[PDB]
Amino acid sequence: GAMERVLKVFHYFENSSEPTTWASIIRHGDATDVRGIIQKIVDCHKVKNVACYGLRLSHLQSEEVHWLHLDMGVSNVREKFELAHPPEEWKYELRIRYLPKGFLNQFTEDKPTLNFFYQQVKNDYMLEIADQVDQEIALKLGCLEIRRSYGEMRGNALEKKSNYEVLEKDVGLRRFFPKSLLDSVKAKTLRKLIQQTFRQFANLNREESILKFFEILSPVYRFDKECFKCALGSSWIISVELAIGPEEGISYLTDKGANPTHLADFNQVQTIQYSNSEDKDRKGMLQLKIAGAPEPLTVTAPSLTIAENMADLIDGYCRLVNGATQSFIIRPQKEGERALPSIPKVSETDDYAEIID
């Protein structure tokens, strides 16, 4: 629009508000790209690992997700998805998506990022598995968040009923523990289990609490890779599940619980070329030219949305491991080749992004 260019971006940089509420309001221009939106948010929190962050668009009433590539124009994206469904039904969310090898060690030297990643993974934990994990695991993770959140509290404070009551009655234990834990244990017993569990973590500082949380969660929940149902090959097409992450590089899965089988490291990917089959129901294809392999790795995704999301992921990792700011995706030249959509074809410039605090 003209004055409709105000974008709300939800994020995981903590403040005193409601977590479901953490967001920045950004006024942008007609030429601002995703890269500019990301940069402005993360520089405001003094992030070092800028290359880790992406922007995910989801429809509040679908499981569908759109990862917005850094070079996509904001107004282009908004106009395209506002043709599908109106503005109020979309959520734009800043997320860490491209993890360096050894990400935890690296994030320890960038506290805003370590904290953001923690809040991100905690949110997904509480939403997707906290009601199902072992109650001992849910007790410990909840106790760690208490320890981290109330950093100045003396380590034995929760032994006092009057202190525990503030968490139970005023704050709400739902902030830290799943409904199923709270609905299934008597209140007095829950109090005792919390007080006791908390003792093993009572002397941990905020960073140590965060690192302990990841240590305890990693066994029961993978938050360091994404998986895609797709198919590999150019002649014979074999259906697979790809597992993409810092430990896997690009891998494929075989048996439930077996180590993934390695295909390629991110640092061997030279180019990424996107194409669409010419079928009435067009297929999304990615060709990855891999250093040392004469044939490209060809991936056929079940939809164009999925292929675009996979391209964002793989390109993000290429940029990250090579320390590059530019994309490795190459321009379409032949029949059926495609670019990713919505790329365009002191603060009065039309790419300005400004946070409205």
Numbering used by the authors: 31 to 375, 391 to 402
Could you share sentences copied from the article?
Focal Adhesion Kinase (FAK) is a 125 kDa non-receptor tyrosine kinase that has multiple implications in cancer cell signaling, invasion, proliferation, and metastasis. FAK also functions as an intracellular scaffolding protein through its FERM domain and C-terminal FAT domain regions where FAK forms multiple protein-protein interactions to connect oncogenic signaling pathways.
Here, we report an x-ray crystal structure of the avian FAK FERM domain at a higher resolution (1.97 Å) than previously reported, elucidating new structural features of the FERM-Kinase linker segment that impact the druggability of the Y397 region. In this work, we solved the FERM structure at a much higher 1.97 Å resolution and we were able to rebuild the segment (363–375) in this area including the RALPSIP motif. In our structure, the Src SH3 binding site makes intramolecular contacts with a pocket in between the FERM F1 and F3 lobes. We speculate that the intramolecular interactions between the Src SH3 binding site and the FERM F1/F3 lobes may be an “autoinhibited” conformation that prevents binding of Src to FAK and therefore the full activation of FAK by phosphorylation of Y576, Y577, Y861, and Y925. Upon further examination in PyMOL we noticed a significant difference in electron density of key activation residue Y397 and surrounding residues in the FERM-kinase linker as well as residues in the F1 lobe proximal to Y397. Computational prediction of this pocket in our structure suggested that the Y397 region has poor druggable characteristics, contrasting previous reports.
